[PDB]
Amino acid sequence: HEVLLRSTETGQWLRINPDGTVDGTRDRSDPGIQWQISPEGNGEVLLRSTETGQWLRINPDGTVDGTRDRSDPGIQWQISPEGNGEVLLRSTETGQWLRINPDGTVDGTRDRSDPGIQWQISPE
To answer: Which residues span the domain enclosing 35?
Structure first.
C-alpha cells in the first residue's frame, strides 16, 4: 500500500535518495518516490521509503533526510487534512511543517502560508 507525496504547487514528488538526501522530482518512475505510512498512534505516523527502508526525518538543524533509526525523535509526523485531499505534514519533534520548494529542495517551515507545505497523498 504505497503512496506518493506530491506538491500541490509544482507537482513535484517527495523523493529519497540512496545517500539519504531528500528532495523533489518530476520523474514519476523514480524508485525513491514510493512511501509507506505506518501508525504510531496518537495521531502520529511514520513515512518509510519502499526503496531504501529509511524513514523520513527532520533534524534539529532544520534539514530533512532519511534515517534507519526507528528511535530517532525526528521521524514522527502528523498529517493534518485541510479538505479535498490537501494536507499538511507537521513534525512532532520540531513543530515545523514539511516544505517542498519550487527548486526541489525539501526542508521545514512555520509559515502556514508557504505554498510548499501543501501536499497531496495518493496511492501508487
So the answer is: 1-124
